[PDB]
């Protein structure tokens, strides 16, 4: 549960939030 939610949110940080910053470098 908590390690699977930390792993899932670190995967969204790595894929979705770093891709939102590949656009939003600025």
Swiss-Prot record:
InterPro entries: Delta_lysin
Domain of life: Bacteria
Pfam families hit by this protein: Delta_lysin
Modified residues (N-formylmethionine): 1
Keywords: Cytolysis, Formylation, Hemolysis, Host cell membrane, Host membrane, Membrane, Secreted, Toxin, Transmembrane, Virulence
Phenotypic consequence of residue 15 to L: In strain: canine
GO BP terms in the entry: symbiont-mediated hemolysis of host erythrocyte
Major location (coarse): secreted
Compartment annotation: Secreted; Host cell membrane
UniProt signal peptide: none
One GO term describing the cellular component: extracellular region
GO terms for MF: toxin activity
UniProt family annotation: Belongs to the delta-lysin family.
Function of the protein: Lyses erythrocytes and many other mammalian cells.
Protein's recorded name: Delta-hemolysin
Organism of origin: Staphylococcus aureus
């Amino acid at each position: 549960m908590a390690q699977d939610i930390i792993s899932t949110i670190g995967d969204l940080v790595k894929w979705i939030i770093d891709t939102v910053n590949k656009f939003t470098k600025k």
